[PDB]
């Protein structure tokens, strides 16, 4: 049920809190900027679902405190996501929507 995550850990780490969550199937994710920025916001596309209306953009930024993008989804099962320029860095994460 309708989620909310921070991108930018309150640490100064790059990871998004929570890193990994669970709604169901039509419920949503509205993430935020908070730290060491800029951060990303883009998704997999695991299954059938369209990754590509619930992700930023392969280029999409939030570059700006409080900057957001929001994402919600309805195939049951989970999806990947990760930061572009963090993934090696571990900014990478797994939401699940059932």
């Known amino acids: ?8 850990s309150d640490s100064g780490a790059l990871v998004f809190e929570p890193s990994t969550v669970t709604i169901k199937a039509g419920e949503e994710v509205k993430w935020v900027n908070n730290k060491l920025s800029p951060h990303n916001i883009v998704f997999a596309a695991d299954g059938v679902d369209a990754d590509t209306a619930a992700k930023l953009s392969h280029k999409g930024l939030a570059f700006a405190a409080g900057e ?8 049951p099962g989970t ?3 990760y930061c572009e320029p963090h993934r090696g860095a571990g900014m990478v994460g797994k939401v699940v929507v059932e």
């Open 79 to 81: 999806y990947t996501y």
């Open 68 to 75: 957001s993008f929001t994402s919600t989804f309805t195939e």
């Open 1 to 8: 049920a309708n989620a909310t995550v921070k991108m930018g």
